[PDB]
Amino acid sequence: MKIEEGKLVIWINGDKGYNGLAEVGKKFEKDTGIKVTVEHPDKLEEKFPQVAATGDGPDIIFWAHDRFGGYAQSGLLAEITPAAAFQDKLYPFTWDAVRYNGKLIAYPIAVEALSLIYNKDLLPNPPKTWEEIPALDKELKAKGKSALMFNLQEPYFTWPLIAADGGYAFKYENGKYDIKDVGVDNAGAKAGLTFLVDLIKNKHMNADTDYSIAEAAFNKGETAMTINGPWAWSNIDTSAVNYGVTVLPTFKGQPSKPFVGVLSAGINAASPNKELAKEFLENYLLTDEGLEAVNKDKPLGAVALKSYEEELAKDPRIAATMENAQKGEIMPNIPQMSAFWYAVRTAVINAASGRQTVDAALAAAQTNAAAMARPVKVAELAHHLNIPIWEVLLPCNFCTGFLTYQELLEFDYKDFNLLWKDGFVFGCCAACAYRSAYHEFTNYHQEIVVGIEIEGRAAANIAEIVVRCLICLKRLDLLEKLDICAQHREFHRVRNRWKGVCRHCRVSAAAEEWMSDLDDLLGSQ
Numbered sequence: 001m002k003i004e005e006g007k008l009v010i011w012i013n014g015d016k017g018y019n020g021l022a023e024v025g026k027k028f029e030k031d032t033g034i035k036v037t038v039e040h041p042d043k044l045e046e047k048f049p050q051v052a053a054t055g056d057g058p059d060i061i062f063w064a065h066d067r068f069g070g071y072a073q074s075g076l077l078a079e080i081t082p083a084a085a086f087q088d089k090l091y092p093f094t095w096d097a098v099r100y101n102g103k104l105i106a107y108p109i110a111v112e113a114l115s116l117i118y119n120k121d122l123l124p125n126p127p128k129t130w131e132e133i134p135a136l137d138k139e140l141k142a143k144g145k146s147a148l149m150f151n152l153q154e155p156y157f158t159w160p161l162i163a164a165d166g167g168y169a170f171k172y173e174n175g176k177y178d179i180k181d182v183g184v185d186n187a188g189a190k191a192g193l194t195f196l197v198d199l200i201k202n203k204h205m206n207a208d209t210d211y212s213i214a215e216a217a218f219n220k221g222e223t224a225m226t227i228n229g230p231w232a233w234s235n236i237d238t239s240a241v242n243y244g245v246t247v248l249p250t251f252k253g254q255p256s257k258p259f260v261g262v263l264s265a266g267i268n269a270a271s272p273n274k275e276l277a278k279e280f281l282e283n284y285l286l287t288d289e290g291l292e293a294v295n296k297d298k299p300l301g302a303v304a305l306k307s308y309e310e311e312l313a314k315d316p317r318i319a320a321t322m323e324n325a326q327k328g329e330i331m332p333n334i335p336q337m338s339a340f341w342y343a344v345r346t347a348v349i350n351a352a353s354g355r356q357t358v359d360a361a362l363a364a365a366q367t368n369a370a371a372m373a374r375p376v377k378v379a380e381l382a383h384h385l386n387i388p389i390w391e392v393l394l395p396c397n398f399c400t401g402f403l404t405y406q407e408l409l410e411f412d413y414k415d416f417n418l419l420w421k422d423g424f425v426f427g428c429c430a431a432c433a434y435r436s437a438y439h440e441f442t443n444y445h446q447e448i449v450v451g452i453e454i455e456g457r458a459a460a461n462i463a464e465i466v467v468r469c470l471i472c473l474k475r476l477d478l479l480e481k482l483d484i485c486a487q488h489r490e491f492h493r494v495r496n497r498w499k500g501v502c503r504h505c506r507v508s509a510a511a512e513e514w515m516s517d518l519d520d521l522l523g524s525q
């Protein structure tokens with residue numbers, strides 16, 4: 001479905017000040033007459049790339065900067081072009097986190113970092129090292145309480161300990177990041193995760209402790225310490241708990257390295273209100289009047305606005321937030337970060353629950369992260385290899401030839417997908433492309449429809465149906481499909497896929513693997 005013009009729909013995570021932002025949306029409504037609707041769906045960071053690719057989705061997407069690069073690579077975000085004076089209104093390093101391929105793709109909002117939150121009534125002077133926490137918990141068990149309870153279901157909360165001794169996501173030496181080099185199955189990461197598992201072995205922590213269980217246990221004085229961010233400061237105030245925000249403990253003397261997140265706001269590429277959403281994000285809801293209103297509901301930490309960050313720089317809770325931030329490192333915004341987080345989430349959960357040893361869980365995370373971040377397009381492959389496209393030597397999957405430079409560019413032009421077999425990567429040459437389309441169309445042809453009849457047969461609008469050229473396999477754009485409708489021409493259903501003629505073209509066991517390889521070549525979308 002298409003987005004309604006004249007209305008702003010904003011998606012933001014549930015643990016943020018969405019009520020504090022909805023009140024700012026009404027201030028923009030009093031001056032412009034445009035209602036600003038906020039929504040906090042579950043798994044919005046995953047549902048957004050599902051619906052933004054079909055033109056649907058909200059107008060503004062709120063998340064930490066690590067996810068936006070994947071949205072920009074998929075062509076889901078609109079380029080942010082602020083004024084030269086507006087870029088100096090915010091800190092320069094916050095803009096570096098929202099730049100992808102030399103282009104601003106989001107608005108920096110606030111810098112987030114984990115910190116050690118403890119109950120001062122139940123723990124004076126928290127420990128400076130993780131190693132003395134088992135001894136500290138044994139004393140509090142006699143008092144009927146526990147020492148530390150934080151979220152163990154999201155790797156964001158456990159990564160400070162894992163990265164303290166050598167664990168890293170993607171290694172960056174001199175230029176960019178190294179996708180093939182992931183630092184999850186190293187000696188330092190195995191040490192950090194082992195200490196976390198032994199904490200669960202000795203009944204000092206519970207593997208099923210999530211976000212709300214660790215929050216309720218700290219908002220009721222049941223546990224002494226809890227690791228969380230600035231957004232969870234308001235729930236502790238309403239619970240009347242004398243707490244403190246201090247530095248995270250160290251492991252092997254080395255300080256914990258939390259992954260620093262810059263909350264950002266991106267504009268949907270299919271939004272009919274790009275200028276309306278830009279006016280809200282820039283002038284009439286980002287200044288000190290807007291950031292202060294959102295901070296009332298859920299605190300944001302060290303904001304990116306200079307005129308407002310100095311008014312809270314002397315905050316003891318925010319001062320420690322920046323101390324853990326400098327001892328950590330900023331999250332990459334590369335599209336491969338989703339593969340990293342998915343692999344580490346499984347590793348921590350499987351290790352904590354005892355389903356895998358720490359060694360096996362981290363070894364599999366290394367393999368899974370690389371296997372999920374592997375290039376799908378020729379351009380991505382050349383960038384992965386840090387070589388120009390014409391230096392790529394890509395075997396064809398369907399014959400013994402290697403692709404020419406033109407065939408390499410045509411591979412991505414026709415929206416093909418790289419094939420991975422036995423470690424080798426494969427493409428498809430021009431002759432095999434046309435040869436596969438002919439065999440597919442002359443052996444698996446199912447039905448014919450005339451123009452707009454495809455919408456009923458496919459149960460989808462013409463814009464949302466994936467149609468490829470029955471001759472050259474290229475993906476048809478919206479105008480090619482509408483032209484077939486206007487000219488009353490034929491759409492064909494072949495191998496449960498829809499085919500047509502692009503504006504440019506005119507006219508047993510070995511075959512099953514052939515047609516199976518063609519499925520992976522064309523993909524689902």
Ligand SMILES: OC[C@H]1O[C@H](O[C@H]2[C@H](O)[C@@H](O)[C@@H](O[C@H]3[C@H](O)[C@@H](O)[C@@H](O[C@H]4[C@H](O)[C@@H](O)[C@@H](O)O[C@@H]4CO)O[C@@H]3CO)O[C@@H]2CO)[C@H](O)[C@@H](O)[C@@H]1O
Pocket residue numbers: 013015043044045046063064065066067112154155156157229261338341342345
């Ligand atoms: O089991 C599948 C799970 O998938 C969903 O969560 C995923 C996300 O899709 C990924 O984006 C990633 O999440 C990262 C996140 O990208 C990163 O910003 C950071 O998130 C912080 C955030 O910065 C901070 O502002 C605050 O909101 O806390 C967040 C962490 O709780 O770290 C995340 C990694 O933990 O990886 C997770 C999966 O690990 C989906 O939301 C899950 O429900 C689902 O189970």
Ligand SMILES: [Zn+2]
Pocket residue numbers: 396397398399400401428429430431432433
């Ligand atoms: Zn070939």
Ligand SMILES: [Zn+2]
Pocket residue numbers: 469470471472473474501502503504505
């Ligand atoms: Zn064609």
